[PDB]
Tab-separated table of C-alpha atoms in Angstrom:
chain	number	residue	atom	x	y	z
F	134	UNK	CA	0.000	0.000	0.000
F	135	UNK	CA	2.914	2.331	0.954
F	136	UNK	CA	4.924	1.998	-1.519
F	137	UNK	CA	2.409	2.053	-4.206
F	138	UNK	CA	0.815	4.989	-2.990
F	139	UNK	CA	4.200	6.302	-3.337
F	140	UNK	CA	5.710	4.919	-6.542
F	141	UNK	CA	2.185	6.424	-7.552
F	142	UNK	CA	2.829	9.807	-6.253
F	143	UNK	CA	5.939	9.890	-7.457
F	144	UNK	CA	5.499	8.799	-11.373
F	145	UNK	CA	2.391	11.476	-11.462
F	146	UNK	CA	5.258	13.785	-10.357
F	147	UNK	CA	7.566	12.868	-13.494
F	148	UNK	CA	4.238	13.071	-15.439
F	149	UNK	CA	3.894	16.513	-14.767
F	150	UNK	CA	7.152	18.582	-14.093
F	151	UNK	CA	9.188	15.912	-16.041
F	152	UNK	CA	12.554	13.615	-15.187
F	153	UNK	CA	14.479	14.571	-12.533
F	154	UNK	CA	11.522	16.377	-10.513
F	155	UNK	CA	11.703	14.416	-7.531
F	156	UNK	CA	14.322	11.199	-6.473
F	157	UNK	CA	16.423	9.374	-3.689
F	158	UNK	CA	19.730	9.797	-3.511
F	159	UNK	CA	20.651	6.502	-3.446
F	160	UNK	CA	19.021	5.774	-7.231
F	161	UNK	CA	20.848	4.590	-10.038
F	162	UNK	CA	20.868	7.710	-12.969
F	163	UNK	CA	18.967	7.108	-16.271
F	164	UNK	CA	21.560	6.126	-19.317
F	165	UNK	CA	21.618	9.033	-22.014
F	166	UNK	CA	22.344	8.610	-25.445
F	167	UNK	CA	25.383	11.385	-25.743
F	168	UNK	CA	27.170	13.358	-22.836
F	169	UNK	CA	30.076	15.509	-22.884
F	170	UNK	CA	33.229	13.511	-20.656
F	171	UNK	CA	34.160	16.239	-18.525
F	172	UNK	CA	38.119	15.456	-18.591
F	173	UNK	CA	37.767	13.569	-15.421
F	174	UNK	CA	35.895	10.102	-14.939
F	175	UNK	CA	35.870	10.814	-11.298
F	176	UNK	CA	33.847	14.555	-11.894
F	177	UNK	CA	32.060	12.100	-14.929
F	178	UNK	CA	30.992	10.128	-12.535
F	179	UNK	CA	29.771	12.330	-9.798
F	180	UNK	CA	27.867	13.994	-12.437
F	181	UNK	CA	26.059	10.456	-12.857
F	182	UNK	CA	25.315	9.957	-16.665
F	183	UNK	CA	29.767	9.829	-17.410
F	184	UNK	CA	29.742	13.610	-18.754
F	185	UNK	CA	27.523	16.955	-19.138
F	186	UNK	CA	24.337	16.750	-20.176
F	187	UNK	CA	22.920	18.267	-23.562
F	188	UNK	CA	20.049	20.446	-24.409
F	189	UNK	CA	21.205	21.694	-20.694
F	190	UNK	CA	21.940	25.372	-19.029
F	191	UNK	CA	25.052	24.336	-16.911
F	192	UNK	CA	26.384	26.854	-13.998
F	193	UNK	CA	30.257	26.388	-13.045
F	194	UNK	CA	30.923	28.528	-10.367
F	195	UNK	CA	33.774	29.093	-7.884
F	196	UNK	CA	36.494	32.261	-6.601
F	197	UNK	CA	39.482	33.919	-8.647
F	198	UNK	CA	41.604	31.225	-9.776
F	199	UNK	CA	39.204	27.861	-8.864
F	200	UNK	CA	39.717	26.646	-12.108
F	201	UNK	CA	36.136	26.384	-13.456
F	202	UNK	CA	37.066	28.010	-16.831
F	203	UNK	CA	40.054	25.030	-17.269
F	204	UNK	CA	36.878	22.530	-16.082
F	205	UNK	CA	34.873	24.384	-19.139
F	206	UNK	CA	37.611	24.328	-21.532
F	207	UNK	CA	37.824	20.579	-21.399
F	208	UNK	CA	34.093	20.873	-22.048
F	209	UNK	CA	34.696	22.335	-25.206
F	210	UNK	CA	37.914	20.546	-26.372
F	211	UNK	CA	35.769	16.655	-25.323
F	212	UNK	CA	32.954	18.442	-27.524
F	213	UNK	CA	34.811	19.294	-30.518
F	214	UNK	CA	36.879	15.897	-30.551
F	215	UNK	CA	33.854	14.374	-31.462
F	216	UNK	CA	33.630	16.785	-34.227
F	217	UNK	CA	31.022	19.247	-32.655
F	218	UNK	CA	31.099	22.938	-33.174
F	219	UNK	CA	31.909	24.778	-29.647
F	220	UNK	CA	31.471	28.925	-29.033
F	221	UNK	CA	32.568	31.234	-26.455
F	222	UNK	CA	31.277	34.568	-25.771
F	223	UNK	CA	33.509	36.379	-23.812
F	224	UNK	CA	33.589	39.485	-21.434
F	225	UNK	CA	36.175	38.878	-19.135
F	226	UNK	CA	39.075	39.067	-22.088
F	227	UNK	CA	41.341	36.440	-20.425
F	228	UNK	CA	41.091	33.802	-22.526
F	229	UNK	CA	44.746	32.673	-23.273
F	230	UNK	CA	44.421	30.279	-26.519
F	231	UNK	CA	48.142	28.379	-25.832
F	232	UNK	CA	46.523	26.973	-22.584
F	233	UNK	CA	43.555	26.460	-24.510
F	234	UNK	CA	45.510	24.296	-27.302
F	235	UNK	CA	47.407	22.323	-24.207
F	236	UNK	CA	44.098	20.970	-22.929
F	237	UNK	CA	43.225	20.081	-26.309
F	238	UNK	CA	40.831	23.157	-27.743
F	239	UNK	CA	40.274	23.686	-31.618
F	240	UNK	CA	40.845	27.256	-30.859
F	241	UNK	CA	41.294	27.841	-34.793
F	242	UNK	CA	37.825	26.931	-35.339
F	243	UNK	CA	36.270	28.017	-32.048
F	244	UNK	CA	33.916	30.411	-32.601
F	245	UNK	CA	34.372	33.460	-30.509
F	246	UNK	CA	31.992	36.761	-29.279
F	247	UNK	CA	33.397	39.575	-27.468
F	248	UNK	CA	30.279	41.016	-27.555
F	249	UNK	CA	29.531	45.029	-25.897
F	250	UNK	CA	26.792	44.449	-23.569
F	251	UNK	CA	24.791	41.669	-21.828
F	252	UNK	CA	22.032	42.228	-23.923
F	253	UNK	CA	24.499	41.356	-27.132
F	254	UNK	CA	25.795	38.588	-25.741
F	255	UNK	CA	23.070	37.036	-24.920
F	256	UNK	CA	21.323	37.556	-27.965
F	257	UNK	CA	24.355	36.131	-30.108
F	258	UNK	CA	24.219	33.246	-27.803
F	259	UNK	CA	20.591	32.616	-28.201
F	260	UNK	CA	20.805	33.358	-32.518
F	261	UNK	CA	23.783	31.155	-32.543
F	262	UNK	CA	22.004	28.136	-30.223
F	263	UNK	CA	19.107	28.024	-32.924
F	264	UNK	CA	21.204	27.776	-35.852
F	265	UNK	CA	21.864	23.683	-34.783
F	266	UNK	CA	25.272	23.962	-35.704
F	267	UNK	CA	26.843	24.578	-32.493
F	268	UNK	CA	27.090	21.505	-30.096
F	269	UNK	CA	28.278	23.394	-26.979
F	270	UNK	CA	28.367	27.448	-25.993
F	271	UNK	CA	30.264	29.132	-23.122
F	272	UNK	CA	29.438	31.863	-21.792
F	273	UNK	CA	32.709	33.485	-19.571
F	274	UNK	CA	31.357	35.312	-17.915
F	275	UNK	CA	27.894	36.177	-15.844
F	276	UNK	CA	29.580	38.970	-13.424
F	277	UNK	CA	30.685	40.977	-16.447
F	278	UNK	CA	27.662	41.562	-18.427
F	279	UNK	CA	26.967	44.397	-17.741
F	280	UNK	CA	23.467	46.164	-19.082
F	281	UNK	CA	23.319	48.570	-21.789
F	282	UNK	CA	21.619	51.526	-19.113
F	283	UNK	CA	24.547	50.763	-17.308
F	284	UNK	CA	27.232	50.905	-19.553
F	285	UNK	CA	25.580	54.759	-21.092
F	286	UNK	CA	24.764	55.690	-17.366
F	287	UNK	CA	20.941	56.107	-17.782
F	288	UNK	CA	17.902	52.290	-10.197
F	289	UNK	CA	20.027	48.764	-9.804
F	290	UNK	CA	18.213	45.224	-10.693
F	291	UNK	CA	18.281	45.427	-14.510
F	292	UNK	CA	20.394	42.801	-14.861
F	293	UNK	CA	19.220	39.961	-12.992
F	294	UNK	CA	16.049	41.226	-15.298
F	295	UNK	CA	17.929	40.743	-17.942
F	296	UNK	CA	19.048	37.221	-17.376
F	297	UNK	CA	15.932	35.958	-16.268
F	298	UNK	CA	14.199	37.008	-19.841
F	299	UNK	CA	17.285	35.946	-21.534
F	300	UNK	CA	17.078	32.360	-20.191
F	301	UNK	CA	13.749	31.534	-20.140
F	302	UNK	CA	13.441	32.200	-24.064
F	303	UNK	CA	16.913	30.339	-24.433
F	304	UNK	CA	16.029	27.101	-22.118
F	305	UNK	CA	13.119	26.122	-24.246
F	306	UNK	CA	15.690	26.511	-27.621
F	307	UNK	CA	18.401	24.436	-26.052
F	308	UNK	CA	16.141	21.497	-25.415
F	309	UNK	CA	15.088	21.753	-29.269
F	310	UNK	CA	18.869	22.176	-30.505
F	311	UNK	CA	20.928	19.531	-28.407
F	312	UNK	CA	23.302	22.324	-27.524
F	313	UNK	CA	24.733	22.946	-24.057
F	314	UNK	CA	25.388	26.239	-22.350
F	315	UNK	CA	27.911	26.728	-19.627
F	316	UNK	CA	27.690	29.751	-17.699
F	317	UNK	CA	30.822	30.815	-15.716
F	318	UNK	CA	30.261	32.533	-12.671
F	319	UNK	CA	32.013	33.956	-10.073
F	320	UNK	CA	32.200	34.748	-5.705
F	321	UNK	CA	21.430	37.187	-7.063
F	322	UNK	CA	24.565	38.813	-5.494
F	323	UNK	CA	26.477	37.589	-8.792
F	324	UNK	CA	23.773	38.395	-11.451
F	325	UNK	CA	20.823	36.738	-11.493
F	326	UNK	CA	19.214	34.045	-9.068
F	327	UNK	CA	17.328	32.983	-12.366
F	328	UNK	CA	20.962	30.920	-13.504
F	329	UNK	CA	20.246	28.774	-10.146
F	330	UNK	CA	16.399	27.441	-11.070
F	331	UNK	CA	16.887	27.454	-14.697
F	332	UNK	CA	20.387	25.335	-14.187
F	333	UNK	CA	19.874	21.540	-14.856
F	334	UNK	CA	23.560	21.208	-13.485
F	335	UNK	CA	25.402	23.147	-10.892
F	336	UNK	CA	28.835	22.520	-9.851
F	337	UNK	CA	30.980	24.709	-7.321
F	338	UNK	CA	34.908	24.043	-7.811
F	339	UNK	CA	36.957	24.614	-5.431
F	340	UNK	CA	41.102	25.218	-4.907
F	341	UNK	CA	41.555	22.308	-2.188
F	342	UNK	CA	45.542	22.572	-1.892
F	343	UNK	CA	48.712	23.044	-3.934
F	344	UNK	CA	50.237	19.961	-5.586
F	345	UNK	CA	53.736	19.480	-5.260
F	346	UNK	CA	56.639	17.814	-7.111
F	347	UNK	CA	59.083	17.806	-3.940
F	348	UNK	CA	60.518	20.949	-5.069
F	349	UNK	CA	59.249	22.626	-8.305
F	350	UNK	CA	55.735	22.749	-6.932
F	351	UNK	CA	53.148	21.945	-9.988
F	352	UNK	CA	49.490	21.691	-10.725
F	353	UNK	CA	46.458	21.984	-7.859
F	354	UNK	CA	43.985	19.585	-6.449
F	355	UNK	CA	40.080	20.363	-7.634
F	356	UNK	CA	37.579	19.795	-5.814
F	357	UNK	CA	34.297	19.942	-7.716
F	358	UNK	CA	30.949	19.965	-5.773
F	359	UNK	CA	28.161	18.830	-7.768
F	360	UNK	CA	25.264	20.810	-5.504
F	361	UNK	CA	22.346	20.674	-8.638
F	362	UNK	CA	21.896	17.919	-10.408
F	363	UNK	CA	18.365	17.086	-12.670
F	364	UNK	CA	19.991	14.480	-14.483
F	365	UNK	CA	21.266	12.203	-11.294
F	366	UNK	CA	21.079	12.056	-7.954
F	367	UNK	CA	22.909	15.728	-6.681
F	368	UNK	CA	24.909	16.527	-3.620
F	369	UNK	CA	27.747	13.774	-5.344
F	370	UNK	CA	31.683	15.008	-5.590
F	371	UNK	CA	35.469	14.588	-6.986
F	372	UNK	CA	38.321	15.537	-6.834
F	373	UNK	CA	41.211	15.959	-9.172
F	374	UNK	CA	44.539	17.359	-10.215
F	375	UNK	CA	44.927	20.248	-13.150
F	376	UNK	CA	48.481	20.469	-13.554
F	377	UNK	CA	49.928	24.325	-14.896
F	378	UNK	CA	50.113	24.528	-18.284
F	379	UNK	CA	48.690	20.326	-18.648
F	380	UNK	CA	45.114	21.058	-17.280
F	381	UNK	CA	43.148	18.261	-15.641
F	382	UNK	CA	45.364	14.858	-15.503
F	383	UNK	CA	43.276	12.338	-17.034
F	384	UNK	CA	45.741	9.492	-15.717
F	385	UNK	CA	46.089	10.952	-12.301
F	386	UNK	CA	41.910	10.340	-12.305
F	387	UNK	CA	42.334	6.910	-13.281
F	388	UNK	CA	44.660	6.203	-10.768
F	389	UNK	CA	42.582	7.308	-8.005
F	390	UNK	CA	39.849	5.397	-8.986
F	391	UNK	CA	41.766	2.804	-10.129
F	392	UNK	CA	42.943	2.261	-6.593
F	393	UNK	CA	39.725	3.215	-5.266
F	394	UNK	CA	36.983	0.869	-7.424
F	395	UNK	CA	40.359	-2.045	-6.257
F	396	UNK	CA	41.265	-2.356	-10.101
F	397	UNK	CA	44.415	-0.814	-9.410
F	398	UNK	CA	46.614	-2.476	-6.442
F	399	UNK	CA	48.790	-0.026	-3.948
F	400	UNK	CA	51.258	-2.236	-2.493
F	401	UNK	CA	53.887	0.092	-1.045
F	402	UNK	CA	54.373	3.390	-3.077
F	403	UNK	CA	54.044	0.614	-5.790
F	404	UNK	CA	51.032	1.111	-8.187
F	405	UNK	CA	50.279	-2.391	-9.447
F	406	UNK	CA	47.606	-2.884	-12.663
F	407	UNK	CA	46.720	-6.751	-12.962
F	408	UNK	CA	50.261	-8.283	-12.352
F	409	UNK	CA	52.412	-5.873	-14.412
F	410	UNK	CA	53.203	-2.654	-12.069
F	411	UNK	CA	53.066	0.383	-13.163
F	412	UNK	CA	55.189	2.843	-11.430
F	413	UNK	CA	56.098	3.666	-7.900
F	414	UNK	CA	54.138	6.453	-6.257
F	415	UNK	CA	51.265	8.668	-8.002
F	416	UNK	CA	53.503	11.012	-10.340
F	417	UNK	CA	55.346	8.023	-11.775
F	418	UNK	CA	52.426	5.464	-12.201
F	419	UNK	CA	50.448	9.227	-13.945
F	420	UNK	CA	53.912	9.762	-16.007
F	421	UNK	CA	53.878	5.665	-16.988
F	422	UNK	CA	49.873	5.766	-18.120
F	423	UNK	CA	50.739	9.090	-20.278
F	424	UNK	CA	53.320	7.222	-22.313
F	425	UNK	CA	51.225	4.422	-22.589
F	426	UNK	CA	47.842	5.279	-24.036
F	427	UNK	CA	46.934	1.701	-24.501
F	428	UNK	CA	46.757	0.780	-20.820
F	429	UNK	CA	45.090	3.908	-20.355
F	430	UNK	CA	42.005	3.341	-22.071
F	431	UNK	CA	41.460	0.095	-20.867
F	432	UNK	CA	41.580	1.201	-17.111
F	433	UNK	CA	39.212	3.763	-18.327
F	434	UNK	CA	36.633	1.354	-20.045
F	435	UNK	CA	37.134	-1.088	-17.214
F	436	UNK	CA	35.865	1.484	-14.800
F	437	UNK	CA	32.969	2.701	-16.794
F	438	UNK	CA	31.877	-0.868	-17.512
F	439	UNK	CA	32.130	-1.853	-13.958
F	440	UNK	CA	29.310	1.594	-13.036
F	441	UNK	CA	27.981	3.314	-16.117
């Protein structure tokens, strides 16, 4: 009776305000077709479905120098090695392209916007979402669109006005198109509360400490905080390692899950993959799995097979 009543309830929920409306956290996620691999299996799999989402408004958000806009980047450059189209309307003018190329970005062919007001970029956004063409659009960043009253001086508000029009024309054309939009955002204090409802996906990255080669010190350690999620059970989080220069160390993440899921065997500084070894402590075993790509991809699929 109980559980009817509320497998009832619950179904006539999903019936009327659609998937991801209601859930327990402890729920296996739905199985979509296509997803965008964030860089990271471990951030892939707290996000539940093995990437982002499409046909999605996505919020990263964090502090100066969290590394959100390296998490996007690897958005774009997963996106594009499938042969999709990626865009990035800018306002912050910080985008440095040799970083971009390092993580893998098609910054030749990456569309870019640097528009003069919010209302501009927006608009470009929304004209360029309906087109079909693009695949993914990013959108660094909401802070710094600024209004066009503001920005020819003719009281406060306009702009969280502005971004709650803006998105709900654009949500309903990104559900038609397939295209995903990541918003960057910084710390409706920052722009609009309308980003947080309208947001199938919201993740807050974090600067957790300073890696550290002995001496030479290099990358950081992310920690990404997936607080919204519509497509999977929410509240889930990673951690990872984006190196300077390198970005977000794909091997490093299958090491720590490797060891963690027990496919990979820690038996004294010793990294150990099914008999052969692999290297002794992290940032040999990471160095051993970038030279060898073949290993790499079957730790990878291994994973995935044994979740999602």
């Amino acid at each position: 009776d109980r559980e009817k009543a509320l497998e009832l309830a619950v179904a006539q929920i999903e019936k009327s305000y659609g998937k991801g409306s209601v859930m327990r956290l402890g729920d296996e996620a739905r199985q979509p077709i296509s997803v965008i691999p964030t860089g990271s299996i471990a951030l892939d799999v707290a996000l539940g479905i093995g990437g982002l989402p499409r046909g999605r408004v996505i919020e990263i958000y964090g502090p100066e120098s969290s590394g959100k806009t390296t998490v996007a980047l690897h958005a774009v450059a997963n996106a594009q090695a499938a042969g999709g189209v990626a865009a990035f309307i800018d306002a912050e003018h910080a985008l440095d392209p040799d970083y971009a190329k390092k993580l893998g970005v098609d910054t030749d062919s990456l569309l870019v916007s640097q528009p003069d007001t919010g209302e501009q970029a927006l608009e470009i956004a929304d004209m360029l979402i309906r087109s079909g063409a693009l695949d993914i659009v990013v959108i660094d960043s909401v802070a710094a669109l600024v209004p066009r009253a503001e920005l020819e001086g003719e009281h406060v508000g306009l702009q969280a006005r502005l971004m709650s029009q803006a998105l709900r024309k654009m949500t309903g054309a990104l559900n038609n198109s397939g295209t995903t939009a990541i918003f960057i955002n910084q710390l409706t204090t920052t722009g609009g509360k309308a980003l947080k409802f309208y947001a199938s996906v919201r993740m807050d990255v974090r600067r957790v400490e300073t890696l550290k080669d002995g001496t030479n010190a290099v990358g950081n350690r992310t920690r990404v905080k997936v607080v919204k999620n519509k497509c999977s059970p929410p509240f889930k989080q990673a951690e990872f390692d984006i190196l300077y220069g390198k970005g977000i160390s794909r091997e490093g993440s299958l090491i720590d899950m490797g060891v963690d899921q027990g496919l990979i065997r820690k038996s004294g500084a010793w990294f150990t993959y099914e008999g052969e070894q692999l290297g002794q402590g992290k940032e040999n075993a990471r160095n051993f799995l970038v030279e060898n790509a073949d290993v790499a991809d079957e730790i990878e699929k291994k994973i995935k097979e044994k979740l999602g």
